[PDB]
Enzyme design. Structure first.
Site, PDB file in Angstrom:
ATOM      1  N   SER A 105      39.947  42.294  32.814  1.00 22.38           N
ATOM      2  CA  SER A 105      38.806  41.814  33.516  1.00 22.38           C
ATOM      3  C   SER A 105      37.496  43.669  33.220  1.00 22.38           C
ATOM      4  CB  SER A 105      38.197  41.773  34.768  1.00 22.38           C
ATOM      5  N   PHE A 106      38.721  44.772  33.266  1.00 19.99           N
ATOM      6  CA  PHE A 106      37.985  46.120  33.484  1.00 19.99           C
ATOM      7  C   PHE A 106      38.569  47.270  32.454  1.00 19.99           C
ATOM      8  N   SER A 107      39.637  46.828  31.868  1.00 16.78           N
ATOM      9  CA  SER A 107      40.423  47.838  31.588  1.00 16.78           C
ATOM     10  C   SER A 107      40.792  47.162  29.705  1.00 16.78           C
ATOM     11  CB  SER A 107      41.207  48.235  31.877  1.00 16.78           C
ATOM     12  OG  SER A 107      42.565  46.901  32.958  1.00 16.78           O
TER      13      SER A 107
ATOM     14  N   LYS B  79      46.192  53.024  29.269  1.00 15.54           N
ATOM     15  CA  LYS B  79      45.290  51.802  30.248  1.00 15.54           C
ATOM     16  C   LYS B  79      43.725  52.678  29.680  1.00 15.54           C
ATOM     17  CE  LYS B  79      45.996  49.822  33.775  1.00 15.54           C
ATOM     18  NZ  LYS B  79      46.678  48.734  35.264  1.00 15.54           N
TER      19      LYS B  79
ATOM     20  N   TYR C 275      55.211  52.207  28.113  1.00 22.42           N
ATOM     21  CA  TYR C 275      55.051  50.987  27.550  1.00 22.42           C
ATOM     22  C   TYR C 275      56.349  49.786  27.604  1.00 22.42           C
ATOM     23  CZ  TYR C 275      55.042  48.143  23.323  1.00 22.42           C
ATOM     24  OH  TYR C 275      55.005  47.157  22.863  1.00 22.42           O
ATOM     25  N   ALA C 276      56.261  48.566  28.289  1.00 22.44           N
ATOM     26  CA  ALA C 276      56.898  47.611  28.918  1.00 22.44           C
ATOM     27  C   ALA C 276      57.186  46.551  27.547  1.00 22.44           C
ATOM     28  CB  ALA C 276      56.392  47.352  29.815  1.00 22.44           C
TER      29      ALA C 276
ATOM     30  N   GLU D 180      55.467  40.674  29.622  1.00 21.77           N
ATOM     31  CA  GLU D 180      55.542  39.915  31.529  1.00 21.77           C
ATOM     32  C   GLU D 180      56.544  38.733  32.039  1.00 21.77           C
ATOM     33  OE1 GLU D 180      51.800  37.926  32.121  1.00 21.77           O
ATOM     34  OE2 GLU D 180      50.456  39.458  31.110  1.00 21.77           O
TER      35      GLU D 180
ATOM     36  N   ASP E 112      50.123  42.683  45.372  1.00 18.59           N
ATOM     37  CA  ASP E 112      49.345  41.394  44.394  1.00 18.59           C
ATOM     38  C   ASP E 112      51.104  41.828  43.744  1.00 18.59           C
ATOM     39  OD1 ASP E 112      48.103  39.707  42.699  1.00 18.59           O
ATOM     40  OD2 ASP E 112      46.471  41.153  41.870  1.00 18.59           O
TER      41      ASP E 112
ATOM     42  N   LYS F 136      53.799  39.537  41.612  1.00 17.43           N
ATOM     43  CA  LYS F 136      53.478  38.520  40.583  1.00 17.43           C
ATOM     44  C   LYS F 136      53.937  38.263  39.558  1.00 17.43           C
ATOM     45  CE  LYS F 136      48.952  38.808  39.206  1.00 17.43           C
ATOM     46  NZ  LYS F 136      47.571  38.266  39.104  1.00 17.43           N
TER      47      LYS F 136
ATOM     48  N   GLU G 208      53.012  38.355  35.998  1.00 20.67           N
ATOM     49  CA  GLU G 208      52.395  38.626  35.579  1.00 20.67           C
ATOM     50  C   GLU G 208      52.469  40.410  35.780  1.00 20.67           C
ATOM     51  OE1 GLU G 208      52.081  36.046  37.545  1.00 20.67           O
ATOM     52  OE2 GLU G 208      49.786  34.870  36.528  1.00 20.67           O
ATOM     53  N   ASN G 209      52.636  40.609  37.312  1.00 18.39           N
ATOM     54  CA  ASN G 209      52.576  42.186  37.189  1.00 18.39           C
ATOM     55  C   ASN G 209      54.316  42.609  37.525  1.00 18.39           C
ATOM     56  OD1 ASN G 209      50.116  42.528  37.525  1.00 18.39           O
ATOM     57  ND2 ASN G 209      49.769  41.983  40.007  1.00 18.39           N
TER      58      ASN G 209
ATOM     59  N   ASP H 278      50.095  47.288  38.460  1.00 19.17           N
ATOM     60  CA  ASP H 278      49.140  47.111  38.938  1.00 19.17           C
ATOM     61  C   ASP H 278      48.778  47.531  40.062  1.00 19.17           C
ATOM     62  OD1 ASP H 278      48.801  46.283  36.597  1.00 19.17           O
ATOM     63  OD2 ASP H 278      47.116  44.996  36.925  1.00 19.17           O
TER      64      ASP H 278
ATOM     65  N   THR I  82      46.271  37.749  44.825  1.00 23.33           N
ATOM     66  CA  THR I  82      46.505  36.644  43.525  1.00 23.33           C
ATOM     67  C   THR I  82      46.246  35.046  44.321  1.00 23.33           C
ATOM     68  OG1 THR I  82      46.644  37.712  42.063  1.00 23.33           O
ATOM     69  CG2 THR I  82      47.064  35.644  41.808  1.00 23.33           C
TER      70      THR I  82
END
Ligand SMILES: Nc1ncnc2c1ncn2[C@@H]1O[C@H](COP(=O)(O)OP(=O)(O)OP(=O)(O)O)[C@@H](O)[C@H]1O
Ligand SMILES: O=C(O)[C@@H]1CCC(=O)N(CCc2ccc(Cl)cc2)[C@H]1c1ccccc1Cl
Ligand code: NA
Ligand code: NA
Ligand code: NA
Length: 287
Positions: free
Chosen positions: A20-22, A39, A89-90, A94, A133, A135, A137-138, A151, A173
């Site tokens: 959303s902002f990055s 980032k 760098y992963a 995810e 947070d 989850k 995704e993180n 994150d 989340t």
């Protein structure tokens, strides 16, 4: 310290993702040929969206971490328009991607990845930091298929001076948010153990335990502990999830009031795990 880096010290390649902002871009550093995930945040946007404290928090928290199961922050820099974070760098992306593609993890893979997450949380909580947070995704995966948790802009460093236990910011989340944050309006380290329980459930069942088409419906289920297990669910993993998805945050296996990570690592689901060696072990193949 090494020379402060500048945008022109890199060649940018593909965008790895957009938040959303990055925006995260793959970058090669000219002077070394090393690869980083950088980032990048537009300052004007961060300001407009009230995100300055988030960016500051991300830097401060990640600067404190030094463990193999976390994305590393190697450097930061800025120019007139942008803030830049040089991250590891992963390459394999995810954890969520794998859950979607395979549907379920087998018991060996569930145990291995759960053990890495437990090891990571033991470290984080030992430093007095709550993720808030956690989850799939993180939880990213490096080239060797070990986890790299990310994150941290919504993480919290609890103050050691005040022996702070509870954090008051409302972040998270919906599928993974703890009942205490919903009902008491604060989170604690044990809130991450609730999220862990949701994640273990998701690895085995293919869906997180509290799920609905909108957030409020999910909230209503969380506070009632309204969920069920699918008929076939590894029994020792079900036992572990039932010991994490406990409404009273002081009664979750692994929490400080339950005497910490020793009893959690001693759970029967982890009987075959060698804890001291995990990041150097070859992960089981995900099939
Ligand atoms: N260190 C990294 N290595 C590889 N990929 C990464 C790394 N860090 C972030 N990503 C990927 O870049 C994408 C964008 O991440 P970013 O933090 O900008 O937003 P987000 O976390 O996906 O969304 P939001 O921040 O809005 O919740 C994400 O899909 C993430 O999986
Ligand atoms: O606080 C810090 O550790 C540094 C120090 C240098 C600095 O001025 N900043 C960023 C300040 C800032 C934050 C957000 C906006 Cl939108 C504008 C400026 C911080 C920063 C620099 C580069 C990359 C990220 C960050 Cl948070
Ligand atoms: Na994220
Ligand atoms: Na993000
Ligand atoms: Na969120």
């Amino acid at each position: 310290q090494p020379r402060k880096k500048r945008p022109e010290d890199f060649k940018f390649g593909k965008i790895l993702g957009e938040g959303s902002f990055s925006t995260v871009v793959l970058a090669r550093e000219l002077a070394t040929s090393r690869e980083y995930a950088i980032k990048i945040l537009e300052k004007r946007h961060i300001i407009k969206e009230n995100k300055v404290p988030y960016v500051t928090r991300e830097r401060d928290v990640m600067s404190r971490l030094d463990h193999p199961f976390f994305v590393k922050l190697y450097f930061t820099f800025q120019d007139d328009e942008k803030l830049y974070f040089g991250l590891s760098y992963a390459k394999n992306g995810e954890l969520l991607k794998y859950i979607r593609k395979i549907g379920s993890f087998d018991e060996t893979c569930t145990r291995f990845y759960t053990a890495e997450i437990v090891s990571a949380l033991e470290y984080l909580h030992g430093k007095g930091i709550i993720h808030r947070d956690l989850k799939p995704e993180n939880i990213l995966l490096n080239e060797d298929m070990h986890i790299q948790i990310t994150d941290f802009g919504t993480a919290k460093v609890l103050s050691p001076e005040s022996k702070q236990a509870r954090a008051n910011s409302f972040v998270g989340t919906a599928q993974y948010v703890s009942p205490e944050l919903l009902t008491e309006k604060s989170a604690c380290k044990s809130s991450d153990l609730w999220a862990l329980g949701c994640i273990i459930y998701q690895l085995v069942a293919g869906l997180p335990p509290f799920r609905a088409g909108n957030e409020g419906l999910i909230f209503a289920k969380i506070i009632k502990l309204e969920y069920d297990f699918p008929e076939k669910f590894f029994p020792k993993a079900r036992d572990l999830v039932e010991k994490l998805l406990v409404l009273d945050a002081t009664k979750r296996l692994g929490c400080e009031e339950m005497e910490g990570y020793g009893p959690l690592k001693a759970h029967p689901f982890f009987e075959s795990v060698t804890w001291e060696n995990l990041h150097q072990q070859t992960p089981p193949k995900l099939t």
